[PDB]
Amino acid sequence: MAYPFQLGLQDATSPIMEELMNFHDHTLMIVFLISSLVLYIISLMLTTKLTHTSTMDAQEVETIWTILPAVILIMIALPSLRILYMMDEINNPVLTVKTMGHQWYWSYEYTDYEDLCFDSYMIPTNDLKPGELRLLEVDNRVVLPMELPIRMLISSEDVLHSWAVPSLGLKTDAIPGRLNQATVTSNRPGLFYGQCSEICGSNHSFMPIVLEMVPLKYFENWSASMI
Amino acid sequence: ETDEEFDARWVTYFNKPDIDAWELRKGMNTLVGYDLVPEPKIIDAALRACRRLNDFASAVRILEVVKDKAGPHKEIYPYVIQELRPTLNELGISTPEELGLDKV
Amino acid sequence: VSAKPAKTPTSAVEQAVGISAIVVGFMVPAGWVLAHLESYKKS
Amino acid sequence: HYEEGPGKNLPFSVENKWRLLAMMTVYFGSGFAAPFFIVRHQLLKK
Amino acid sequence: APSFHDKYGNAILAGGAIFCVSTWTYTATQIGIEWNMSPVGRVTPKEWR
Amino acid sequence: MFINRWLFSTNHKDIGTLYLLFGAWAGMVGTALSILIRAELGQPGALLGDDQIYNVIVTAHAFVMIFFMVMPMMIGGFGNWLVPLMIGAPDMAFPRMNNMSFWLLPPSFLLLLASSMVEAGAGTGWTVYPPLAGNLAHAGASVDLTIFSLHLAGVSSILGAINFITTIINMKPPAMTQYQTPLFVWSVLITAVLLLLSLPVLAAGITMLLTDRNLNTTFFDPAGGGDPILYQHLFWFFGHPEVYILILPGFGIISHVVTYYSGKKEPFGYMGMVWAMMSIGFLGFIVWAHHMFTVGLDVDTRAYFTSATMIIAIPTGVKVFSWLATLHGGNIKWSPAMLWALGFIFLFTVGGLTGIVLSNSSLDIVLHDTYYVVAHFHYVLSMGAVFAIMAGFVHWFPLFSGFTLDDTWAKAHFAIMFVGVNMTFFPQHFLGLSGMPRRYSDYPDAYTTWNTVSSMGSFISLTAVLIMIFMIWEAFASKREVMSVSYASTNLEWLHGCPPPYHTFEEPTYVKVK
Amino acid sequence: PSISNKRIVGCICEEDNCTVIWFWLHKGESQRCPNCGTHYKLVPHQM
Amino acid sequence: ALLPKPQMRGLLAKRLRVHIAGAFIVALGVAAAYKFGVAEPRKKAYAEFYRNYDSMKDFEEMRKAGIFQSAK
Amino acid sequence: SVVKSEDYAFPTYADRRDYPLPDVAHVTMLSASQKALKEKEKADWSSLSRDEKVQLYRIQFNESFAEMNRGTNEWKTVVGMAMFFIGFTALVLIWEKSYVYGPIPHTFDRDWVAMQTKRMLDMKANPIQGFSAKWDYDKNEWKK
Ligand code: HEA
Ligand code: HEA
Ligand code: CUA
Ligand SMILES: [Cu+2]
Ligand code: NA
Ligand SMILES: [Zn+2]
After folding, report:
1. Closest-CA residue of chain A to F429
2. What is A95-226's CATH number?
3. How far is the CA of F379 from the centre of ligand 2 (A)?
């Protein structure tokens, strides 16, 4: 989750947030290269005192100036497609979670076997326990097992929402009359904080998401205790 | 084209026997647009052309745009003046540096 | 674009008066309505 | 025919400096002060 | 001729520099803006229950 | 004498003048809304309370700055003042529809201001996505009034586009080709083409949304078999051509400004400029679903859309390198509009590369609906389009008014504006990377400091437009007219005087082909 | 020809050239294009 | 002695060629500066973290202070 | 004096180094002494002194290239005005912080942020590089 004076991304937990973070470093290096090229060329080419304001050969450098940005654009594009095709492969998941975003609260169904469902509302600011996080803590944290492929189906009852957790690299639209796939994994246990990204009314800032990732035996104990 | 037809065409254009002020202004206004410091016999032809149509001050700005057409490095203009000296004391034309037009 | 001399040239005091007028004419109503948001919230 | 020249092709008289200063500041200040009064209205309603 | 800029540019640099840094130091420090600085190495962690 | 000159006007200069006045007023409305938005986000807490009033302010800021400041001033004002002047036409082809388009604009503004005043308020974003903008979450007359505002603005821009295309194609001298026209005429042509090829799509979309709201049709709610992804398809099929409408006459303006104040008689690679503008216009219609990378499309569809986004990225690179190449070895005159143009070049380059970062669909899955997108689109809109507007205004204010601005106050205004908007929108990259999403009135504490920095930057930009008003007043506080203008042989609009008379080109231009 | 004392004259003075160059042409004897010098004369008597 | 003949043509062109060489070197240099400063240290930091990572002891030392709603 | 509205039609003397020989003389009409210099111009230039040269060059042209390329001092004034008005923005921000803004939420004092960043490294928030990787988990201090 976010810390003060943070510049870059949140640190990765899922594998895909590592590959997207490395690709972000790659494309930001490319952005720095092109921006420094443009800035150094304009600062060079304003400060001269020589002049040449007559007829110039119109087409003698255009082929280079069209092939080089194509080379850098495909240099961006091939890892983009390579990681683009690495989100919807064969998963063979473990658990299936169903998340419905009702009018300013999330709801979670674990009904693979022994149908379980609960609601996630925000702990209010005046009702916070000490040490807690403002605008991010929930009533019921969403408990998932460690390092396993978890199928996740996202929708909403009424309007558009967006189930998003940044540190796992998940952001998926919640559309009524739809059902959206997201596979979620992890590598470390702990608590991950996200919040809704689609505009959904007068309390749009006020639905958080807390994912609590635990070992599988403790997930089984939590599933037995919660039902 | 290459250097010799450019240079020969400009020195023959600036030694037109019936030249007036307008085409002299065209020549000395289009010559300073090139990525080029003008060759000293083009400047010799232009100074004699200014003398032929009986006009003084445009020759002094011809010398001035020779000086500031060079740019940063100042090994052009003393060399151009050191070649243009005999023209400069056969016509009576004065350098910009001695008239006080270079002291800002 | 070269220019005429100013037909009615402006003294520096009148430029200061004009910029003070623009600042006060912009920050009186917005400054007044942000001077009390809590009074609009049924104090 | 309509007036031709500098300062006459505009829909307001520029012939007085201070009158035009007052007109500019009330024009642009009304533009700046419209949404603040809108927000005041929405806060006064509910 | 001594124009406006030739001496008034030095005067306006001195005034603008000292005025801007003085009141920006004051609005950054003295008016109690909580900047929410990074807690690395500054605040000791306190035992929560 | 007044109502015949201005209210019943039938010549292009007066319509452009009223376009400039209306756009200046609407821009001041928009910057007031922006001051409100950065006022709530300055410190943690609820300055205004709920998120509904904040969303109303956000939607109003978006719609007022898009459809009422850049489009009228830029397209209408600069096109009506300059397009019959550069091509040598006496007037517009259909001046009555030009007048009707301008006079249709303030009804649309009044309908938007009424939309913000009804008891709900259209707090949905300028994307008016159902079912949030339905008659369930927004039961009231605010969304309908916003829809009719967009309808009136669309009819205005369609009429202007028809008038501009017929006056550019038809009212040339009979010996000139279309490839001998200035570059701003080309930008106005291509902008009008994309306007009348794009606006009926949103017209049909908001018509269907209005009939969903009030005629019990089920185009968009899934309870009757509808689908809101259809609305998103139609809206963005309009919406990215709308984006390139925002940016293209700015390209023409900066090409003219750099060519003038650089001392060049032509921009370098005029054919490359024309081809790149045609390519940007043609490829603006096939890249819309880069606004929809997290909605749940096919993986092959998003692969095509990020690829097509790279092919739309190349020819604007051709344009910016040709701007650099026409900067090469000229008599660089450091005018204020020169500083606005160079600021346009650098900051629009930065906004373009942030768009290229957003172009990849995977990093778009990470960075959808965050403030990284906000930093991207403000670095193109609020910096490139605004800097092109200010470059054109500073450059052609001697032509319009007849008086010359004080250059020292103008350069001070550029410096204040540059510092203010750069410190406004650079921490938003870090806010987007850290993960604080869009449309929020309150944020967690970890996003505090950048937000604080961003808020105070807005005030510096506010001071900029304040002294901008002083600039205009100072011109009319001075009443200094013009000797004459340099390089008036190549620029046709400068050769009739400053300001030009009411009747220009009564005796038309004389150009031959044989 | 013209009906007034002066007229805007635009020159394409070499072919396949982008920018026209424009200049006023007055009465009296012939003026000329500022870069190519093709001679232009004005006979203002038409209607 | 007297002055020699210096180069009179192609001045801005030769300035452009030496400084386009300088432009490519400085742009690749600042890109490599960002790369070797940020991207490679991040990659080796992730490699160091996950090469000898135990999840059971990590979870046990999170749950010894009572953060999870499932492990008490 | 004031001239008719066709001041745009006729060419005007414009001074720039891109146009070294302008088409219009700087001073159009001349006095009788200036006609004496103009009559002297048809003879040789050898009997021309310094002062006739300087004042006829000031008849035909207005500023030399040394005068027009001189370094004026407007950038100091421009950035000084910029820092004036940016200081006035600081005053406006001071006024808003004093009057417009209310209190901060209670999650910003020393004890709440102390327990919050104790918990934040307790659950190991981004412990690879960002925040909990800057804390030493053995000596119970920050990394030095
Ligand atoms: C001025 C208006 C403007 C302009 C020009 C652009 C231009 C671009 N926009 Fe943007 N955009 C918006 C206005 C604009 N946009 C708005 C208002 C939104 C918000 C919509 C919403 O609310 O959802 C938006 C949203 C938006 C998104 C949505 C992200 C999200 O929310 O999920 C994306 C992503 O694809 C995007 C991409 C682009 C791209 C790729 C360009 C390009 O056209 C940029 C041009 C590229 C350059 C100028 C690059 C410079 C190139 C060179 C210098 C050559 C060298 C290059 C290489 C070697 C590679 N835009
Ligand atoms: C033209 C488009 C435009 C322009 C200029 C701006 C300008 C600014 N914008 Fe805006 N903005 C948008 C379009 C624009 N924006 C859009 C489309 C959104 C998305 C809304 C949504 O989420 O749905 C948005 C969203 C948006 C948000 C998101 C709020 C949220 O979602 O939580 C914020 C807050 O930081 C913001 C801030 C600003 C600021 C601080 C400026 C400053 O730059 C203000 C300064 C601007 C000016 C001063 C105007 C320039 C005019 C002149 C200088 C005078 C002109 C007159 C003459 C020349 C005569 N903008
Ligand atoms: Cu749900 Cu925003
Ligand atoms: Cu787009
Ligand atoms: Na707030
Ligand atoms: Zn010609």
Report:
1. A7
2. 2.60.40.420
3. 10
